[PDB]
Write an enzyme that holds these catalytic residues in place. Structure first.
Site, PDB file in Angstrom:
ATOM      1  N   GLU A 263       0.720  -0.992   0.009  1.00 17.82           N
ATOM      2  CA  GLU A 263       0.105  -0.029   0.061  1.00 17.82           C
ATOM      3  C   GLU A 263       0.916   1.555   0.405  1.00 17.82           C
ATOM      4  OE1 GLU A 263      -1.924  -1.049   3.357  1.00 17.82           O
ATOM      5  OE2 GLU A 263      -3.918  -1.247   2.619  1.00 17.82           O
TER       6      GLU A 263
ATOM      7  N   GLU B 249      -3.906  -9.381  -0.903  1.00 14.90           N
ATOM      8  CA  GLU B 249      -4.938  -9.157   0.879  1.00 14.90           C
ATOM      9  C   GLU B 249      -6.616  -9.100   0.313  1.00 14.90           C
ATOM     10  OE1 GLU B 249      -4.332  -5.600   3.489  1.00 14.90           O
ATOM     11  OE2 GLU B 249      -2.127  -6.884   2.786  1.00 14.90           O
TER      12      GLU B 249
HETATM   13  O1  LIG Z   1      -0.815  -5.005   6.827  1.00 17.62           O
HETATM   14  C1  LIG Z   1      -2.282  -4.723   6.863  1.00 17.62           C
HETATM   15  C2  LIG Z   1      -2.339  -3.825   5.408  1.00 17.62           C
HETATM   16  O2  LIG Z   1      -1.620  -4.889   4.123  1.00 17.62           O
HETATM   17  C3  LIG Z   1      -3.855  -3.503   5.257  1.00 17.62           C
HETATM   18  O3  LIG Z   1      -4.343  -3.077   3.993  1.00 17.62           O
HETATM   19  O4  LIG Z   1      -4.619  -3.110   6.161  1.00 17.62           O
HETATM   20  C4  LIG Z   1      -4.775  -3.975   7.054  1.00 17.62           C
HETATM   21  C5  LIG Z   1      -3.692  -4.913   7.823  1.00 17.62           C
HETATM   22  O5  LIG Z   1      -3.605  -6.049   8.815  1.00 17.62           O
END
Ligand SMILES: O[C@@H]1[C@@H](O)[C@H](O)OC[C@H]1O
Ligand SMILES: O[C@@H]1[C@@H](O)[C@H](O)OC[C@H]1O
Ligand SMILES: O[C@@H]1[C@@H](O)[C@H](O)OC[C@H]1O
Ligand SMILES: O[C@@H]1[C@@H](O)[C@H](O)OC[C@H]1O
EC number: 3.2.1.37
Lengths: 500, 500, 500, 500
Positions: free
Chosen positions: D160, D277
């Site tokens: 990010e 993710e």
């Molecule tokens: O590390 C993680 C991050 O990458 C995400 O964007 O937000 C949640 C966090 O736990």
């Protein structure tokens, strides 16, 4: 001594046919916890592909049953045990080299049995019922394991039918009838299943000639020839054991070479050839099996055997055996590569050492094998068995091994009468029949080869190895490339440690 | 040589105080898989009762937290990690020799830290908050493990407060204040919990004198004295390692004997004494720890140490350590008895060998211990460390061991520079920093002592043992009664086997 | 419904006599991997102290042998198997409730055998040889396991000698002669070894009267009485199975109470009493054993049985059985609490549930048991077996359980025809004889009781439980103290989660 | 209700893209025993191909070090930890979806860190040193694992970088410079290694547009696009937790579909797309993750997600997490599919259930997926999440499933607020922060879906299923062919058993 200059170029190739199969006690004993621990143990060290044993159809496994509903007598096929048995064979990663037989009780025509567990050695009182038996089993195997799997299991028909003990009156003509009905029954289920025989043992090769002529002439399918090989002369049984003279290894390799010819001159010159059973003594009670001698002796057979046969199965992998009643001592001359309580006999490490061999065979003579692996590293296995009672068993060597490296790391493993000789320690302990947990532990501790590392430099591309082989010794050298990282340890200097 | 006639009668007795405790890296590292495999491994070989390490209160374990709800700042005690940690310690069958400290971040008064993991070495900015911290932990332990359990865990307050690195300015008077507030907090929860200190290290025994006077005069409870002991002189650090001279073992045993006196002459003459930490070098990067030398050196301390102290904890059981950053090579002079990948260092087998010792101490000198077990069998451990650089390190022996038997089975285990010396092979391999799976396997194979069985007869009640100890060698002999069963094997005759 | 107000005070006490012993198939089968996995599995769930089975002296275990050295015939005692067997029993933490018998082949006087494995049921052709057999075994046990251990193993002589099938012509007078020679042989080795009999089965108690008179009058030592108990009427065998009516549980408890009297009125009024074998059907092929009914039925016996006997062994723990040949299907009415492939039958969870019971017995009636543990928590077990074919099997309850707490955490486990009924699912699958790996997995997944947690508050010291028991259901409630920590979660509010 | 007639013909196909990858806590935590037990546990149930987490370059793993030898400062790359880490990843059979970053301390340019473990979020003070770092790591991986292996590991650059917390000032232009130097360094080692980015999170897709334009125009290699996706609105943190509204699943699937377009309209229209993710809440402390709701919600995403992306990694597999300090209770809103002590959360069984799905997709709507396996069997997964606070959450169904069989065996598994809801029981227990061994056991016992077997017949080729979905329920039906063997049991008749 004995000097040798291993050539840097590879002519012949060494195969893993020596580990294609291993022998076992009757399939019923595979239900034993002891049996399976040992099988797993052994598979973690030697990657045997198949396992060959008798009793698939004997009553302890209990496949063939009969139910009475009045006057009606219908057969019942119980698969509770072979399922567990074969399921556990596959779980461990080993395929069964199926051996049909012996004859179930409710199907036998006579009463003659063999071994302490009494397997019926008479032909079926009705080949029709027998044929349905065979077909019901194969269909079930196919049903639970899938056709793709079963298709990989070869099927050997009967065992040593050339002996009066395993086949009623050694009726050769009856055997062929058995072979046909069974070979037909099998091929009925699937024309691709592998089947063969005659499963005879040394001293009746004419059986294989007739067996092959019989199939050609009677149009019976054959997919492979089967035979056994041992080298123990006659001996007299004690109510405890038998001692026999072991003919040199040369005579077993000739039997291999011989029967090979009988096949290439038959109507089926390309049939694969499987020595479904071999070892020095053919008795499950000859201490030769527990000696470091047996290990050095077999070393050669693992070295050359594969040149003439498609596979040769060492009889057996474990002492979990019952042909001559339950063993009566930690060491008793059992066939197994491993003694009870998972104590590896020296023969076990011979097999272990051959795991080191590679495809490229650089050199080989009656007592030494030298190969090269994919990575370019070299491995050597020398062995010095003592067939007679010499005063000087020793043998010195000086081998020049070619190496694509300059810095060589050496890993040496030795197995002789002083190392990896649990049997010897067993004697030290006073030959306990039922050792205690600690005696068993000491044995396990002793039952490991001696390992020595070292580090020399190869000059002019060759590394010179000098070494002595004691009585019945067997050694393995693995020479790999040494890439020293010592210069990375800032200030490294062992001489700055008390005494170094 | 060196002749000895072990007396048949027992005067002194040998205790298992040598295995009461072992050292470990900070408790946080006990969360590592590698750590626990090694702990289990080690416990299966040596039955250590307790384990002693730092960090119970450090932030990685994260017990002490603070929540903000506006202007209100309430503390929060998080037990997620020590629960898992202590649960796993008990599961394996080992009790924690708790060491309170260091100082949590949200409670510290300064910023001085120690080690690569930076544990705060300053006193609490509010002893009131600290006291509640201590009490909350003990109550929780009591809550999850039961009072009967916790009651067996001793509590050492802080670590080497005599050093500026572990305690701000080595403020002796402040330490005593810490000791009191903590000793009081603990006794508040349960008056029976064991607590002690000062946890100092060699060269400031006056600290123990003041510590004991302080408690008597200020009426502070003490249940045991604590101190460390090493024998490495000054050395200069490399960005990789440090080499130091190791003073003979005699000087460590004197320190034990010495501090014993300081206790029997205090107002608490019967307080138990725990060497909560010991070894040759006090650095986690001195290769002495990986050498067969360290093993022969410590051999003596395990032999006599227990005569003066209630327990002495070897620092440490494993190389899973981080005080000086993550290790950077298979062997790096770590404290552990076991190297990474569960490769036992030679010192490990010294401890292993002492498992053989019995209650009855028959003989003992600066290099040998001889005892008798309940069954009447005898065990001997000799050791020949080389403190200097001699040309002839060897040492011959000829011990006369008394035996209640006539037929003796002998089990010999040897550890020297040629056997059980993984470090030596590591060198052979070229000191790989990150060995491959097979290099690790070879090491594991080498990292075992040499075992030799044999079988002699004791005449006149004594068995005569003759043997040579190489450089830094350490040997163990276990003589048990041999009850021969050979006459039970009808026809037994090894001479009837090829070559025998 | 059925209302009950469990009293807050404890009069009677509940013992763990229900878990003192369990039955097993012949000791030879204990060599099977399947057998031992199951024993371990079962021991991890129910802490049975002893295990009772036949065959110690049968030939598969092969203890008794004979060697011929010309005209000389000496007996040979082979311990290879019972060593492994008993070693594995102790490893798992279970003692053998030894049962001497049956009669080895080379010692038998007749040819009559029993069961599919054919154990000889005739007396020794020479009690002298038999006496030496018994003594040789005990000495060996003493030799390997130590006298302190063996001294804890009781010795039952023979099995149901009151039946023509287990004892030649049910010769009562001959049995007593067997009992005497054996009881004498045993006591010869050590006067403290426990021995007893007659091992008869329901319908011949006069045997126990004569057995006790016989010992008193002939001065034969007795240490305990032995008998079996079942409740299945006559039934007709199918070549596959047998169906039988099961008399209510009351009649078994009477048999217990009855034989108790016969003992207190004999010359040995204080002899301990062991029901070395019990269950509903006495056949290893009656599907009643696999039904959730069997579980609810036995529930009562575990509840009251201990009031009259010292121990009652459920026959058996596993379906690894061979009396009537090898099983022929996943479910076949075997005795075992656990079916093949370690699939717990519902009866298994009845035993599991009783692990929850405590010492203090607060309430008990023909279908419910309520106790209190040390911590003050309460556990309840209700059961509703359906003996007949009713249209409304259901049964409602409303029990008032006293509780020293106000906040109660409830853990409910239920076992009925819809939950924990692998047999039912087996039917769903179409009663596969040889299920596939996944069918076995589904079964294992179904073979678990239903668990429901909840949380109510006890007012006025009592918690009111309301619940319905389906057909053959069995439920367990464990009420422990709930200590809520919710107020520790700053801002905790489940209503702030989508949908809650 | 809701009627549906699943078509007998397959148009679309269902892929296993849903199980290509899973998220994890920083790689350092993979050293924890707890971590690995859970990974193994999870891998035995769900066959995830890759695992994605941060911290490869953080200091706890400690790869980047620097040694000072006077004025000379040479970098040192320590691989002791990632070796153990990656070795253990492969041992379990899972590949690492490598994520380069964050910034090591001795290389950082600033001091800004992120998370409780403080990973440096500033760019290198010298990209030259950084480039050598990257290359040294890849070479080492290649060195230990072989090029064939490493070649299968994709490399995501940073995390990010569009957020000020993970990248200094969200310097987009600096990120691209990082991307280039790293993408170049990697391709230098081997031109075939997969590399991509930008690893941004929802609400800045312009980043991906610029990222793709940047690479085309500056000639920087790209092998895949990377992005994250969540659906939790703003919420306010408590010093313990955060509650957030979860937008319907539709909005996440749109984000997938959206970013897909941005790629097909770029200069690299065929680049693979990885949602490295995803989950509902983006906080490691939102109890939504522990609720049966989260499971029903994600059910849909597993159903459709694969239509638009190459893989979507659920964040995360375990609660072994530390971004917001060490967890402080059994349940705390952690990301993991599995809670501490290997207690499967309901979301875990959603994934488990999808293991049942087959290639042939017969039917699908916003709340149901129906597929057919190779064997011809059918599997159905329906789910009823409750986004709002309705009074009637229930939902009835009546699905007509086509079946090539007439006799159908049914296996039903259900997960809702009453079944497989450990969180619910945790509440019952009073939300213990540090449950006891038995509380953990009860939870593990509750943490399993409800299973119901049955057996109906399909008429006219279709089987009609009727069922009700409770609040947040999720059910799975597997309909296989039932081959009844009942007629093989001679005399089989359950009505001959008491009560049946
Ligand atoms: O590390 C993680 C991050 O990458 C995400 O964007 O937000 C949640 C966090 O736990
Ligand atoms: O069963 C074996 C038999 O096949 C072989 O021929 O001789 C040795 C036996 O153990
Ligand atoms: O932490 C240890 C310390 O307590 C000791 O004093 O010196 C060695 C260190 O490893
Ligand atoms: O062997 C068992 C026997 O002892 C009992 O009496 O009846 C049932 C049998 O299984």
């Amino acid at each position: 001594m004995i000097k040798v200059r291993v050539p840097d170029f590879s002519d012949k190739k060494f195969s893993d046919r020596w580990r294609y199969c291993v022998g076992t006690g009757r399939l019923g004993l595979a239900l034993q916890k002891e049996y399976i621990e040992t099988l797993k143990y052994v598979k973690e060290n030697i990657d045997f592909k198949y396992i060959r044993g008798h009793g698939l159809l004997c009553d302890d496994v209990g496949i063939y049953r009969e139910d009475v509903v009045g006057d009606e007598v219908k057969p019942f096929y119980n698969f509770t045990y072979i399922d567990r048995i074969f399921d556990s064979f596959l779980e461990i990663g080993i395929r069964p080299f199926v051996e049909i037989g012996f004859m179930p009780k409710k199907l036998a025509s006579g009463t003659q049995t063999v071994f302490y567990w009494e397997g019926n050695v008479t032909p079926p009182k009705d080949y029709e019922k027998w044929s349905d038996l065979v077909k019901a089993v194969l269909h079930h195997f196919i049903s639970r394991y899938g056709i793709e799997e079963v298709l990989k299991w070869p099927f050997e028909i009967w065992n040593e039918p050339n002996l009066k003990e395993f086949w009623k009156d050694a009726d050769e003509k009856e055997y062929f009838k058995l072979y046909k009905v069974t070979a037909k029954a099998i091929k009925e289920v699937n024309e691709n299943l592998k089947v063969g025989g005659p499963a005879i043992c040394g001293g009746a090769d004419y059986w294989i000639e007739d067996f092959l002529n019989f199939c050609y002439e009677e149009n019976v399918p054959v997919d492979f020839v089967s035979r056994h090989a041992y080298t123990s002369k006659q001996g007299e049984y004690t109510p405890h054991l038998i001692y026999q003279e072991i003919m040199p290894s040369e005579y077993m390799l000739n039997e291999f070479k011989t029967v090979r010819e009988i096949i290439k001159n038959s109507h089926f010159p390309n049939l694969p050839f499987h020595i479904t059973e071999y070892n020095t003594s053919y008795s499950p009670q000859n201490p030769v099996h527990d000696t470091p001698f047996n290990a050095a002796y077999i070393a050669r057979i693992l070295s050359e055997g594969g040149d003439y046969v498609d596979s040769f199965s060492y009889w057996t992998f474990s002492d979990v055996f019952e042909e001559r009643d339950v063993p009566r001592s930690q060491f008793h001359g059992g066939f197994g590569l491993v003694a009870l309580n998972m104590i590896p006999k020296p023969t076990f490490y011979t097999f272990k050492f051959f795991n080191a061999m590679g495809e490229e065979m650089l050199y080989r003579d009656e007592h030494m094998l030298v190969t090269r692996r994919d990575d370019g590293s070299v491995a050597l296995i020398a062995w010095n068995e003592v067939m007679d009672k010499t005063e000087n068993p020793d043998e010195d060597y000086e081998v020049e091994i070619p190496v694509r490296f300059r810095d060589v790391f050496i890993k040496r493993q030795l197995i002789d009468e002083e190392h990896g000789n649990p049997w010897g320690t067993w004697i030290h302990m006073g030959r306990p029949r039922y050792p205690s947990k600690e005696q068993v532990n000491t044995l396990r501790e002793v039952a490991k080869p001696e390992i020595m590392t070292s580090q020399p430099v190869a000059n002019d591309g060759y590394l010179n190895l000098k070494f002595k082989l004691g009585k019945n010794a067997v050694v393995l050298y693995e020479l790999t490339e040494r890439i020293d990282e010592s210069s990375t340890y800032i200030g490294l200097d062992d001489s700055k440690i008390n005494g170094y």
